Amino acid sequence: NNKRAPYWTNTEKMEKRLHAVPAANTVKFRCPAGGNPMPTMRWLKNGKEFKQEHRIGGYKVRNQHWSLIMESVVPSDKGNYTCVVENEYGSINHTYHLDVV
């Protein structure tokens, strides 16, 4: 049980690309990837990176992987979300198109 690349379970193309981001609200980030118990993922929004250790208003993640919720009241202006999940066997990148409402 170490770090092993997680295979995407749910298509992000059908639940992450075209989405609706409510201004002054928390952003729902989905990146389901079944794999080992050590999944590493980077968060990039419109060319901006945000560490889980620090988030606008707070940071919450389910267990460790699958779903991740971040609070974006100001950054919401940027409706570009790209999920890059890295592992000990490689790094993957995913782009999503959110719209500011």
UniProtKB/Swiss-Prot annotation:
Outcome (variant: R55C): In breast cancer samples; infiltrating ductal carcinoma; somatic mutation
Lineage: superkingdom: Eukaryota
Cystine crosslinks: C31-C83
Residues of this chain annotated as glycosylated in UniProt: N80, N93
Coiled-coil stretches: none
Subcellular location: Cell membrane; Golgi apparatus; Cytoplasmic vesicle
Domain Ig-like C2-type: from-to ranges: 6-99
Chain positions covered by the region annotation Heparin-binding: 13-30
Modifications the protein undergoes after translation, according to the UniProt entry: Autophosphorylated. Binding of FGF family members together with heparan sulfate proteoglycan or heparin promotes receptor dimerization and autophosphorylation on several tyrosine residues. Autophosphorylation occurs in trans between the two FGFR molecules present in the dimer. N-glycosylated in the endoplasmic reticulum. The N-glycan chains undergo further maturation to an Endo H-resistant form in the Golgi apparatus.
Family: Belongs to the protein kinase superfamily. Tyr protein kinase family. Fibroblast growth factor receptor subfamily.
Comment block on domains: The second and third Ig-like domains directly interact with fibroblast growth factors (FGF) and heparan sulfate proteoglycans. Alternative splicing events affecting the third Ig-like domain are crucial for ligand selectivity.
Function comment: Tyrosine-protein kinase that acts as a cell-surface receptor for fibroblast growth factors and plays an essential role in the regulation of cell proliferation, differentiation, migration and apoptosis, and in the regulation of embryonic development. Required for normal embryonic patterning, trophoblast function, limb bud development, lung morphogenesis, osteogenesis and skin development. Plays an essential role in the regulation of osteoblast differentiation, proliferation and apoptosis, and is required for normal skeleton development.
Clinical disorder: Crouzon syndrome: An autosomal dominant syndrome characterized by craniosynostosis, hypertelorism, exophthalmos and external strabismus, parrot-beaked nose, short upper lip, hypoplastic maxilla, and a relative mandibular prognathism. Jackson-Weiss syndrome: An autosomal dominant craniosynostosis syndrome characterized by craniofacial abnormalities and abnormality of the feet: broad great toes with medial deviation and tarsal-metatarsal coalescence.
Subunit organization: Monomer. Homodimer after ligand binding. Interacts predominantly with FGF1 and FGF2, but can also interact with FGF3, FGF4, FGF6, FGF7, FGF8, FGF9, FGF10, FGF17, FGF18 and FGF22 (in vitro). Ligand specificity is determined by tissue-specific expression of isoforms, and differences in the third Ig-like domain are crucial for ligand specificity. Isoform 1 has high affinity for FGF1 and FGF2, but low affinity for FGF7. Isoform 3 has high affinity for FGF1 and FGF7, and has much higher affinity for FGF7 than isoform 1 (in vitro).
Protein's recorded name: Fibroblast growth factor receptor 2
Gene (name only): FGFR2
Residues of the full protein shown: 149 to 249 of 821
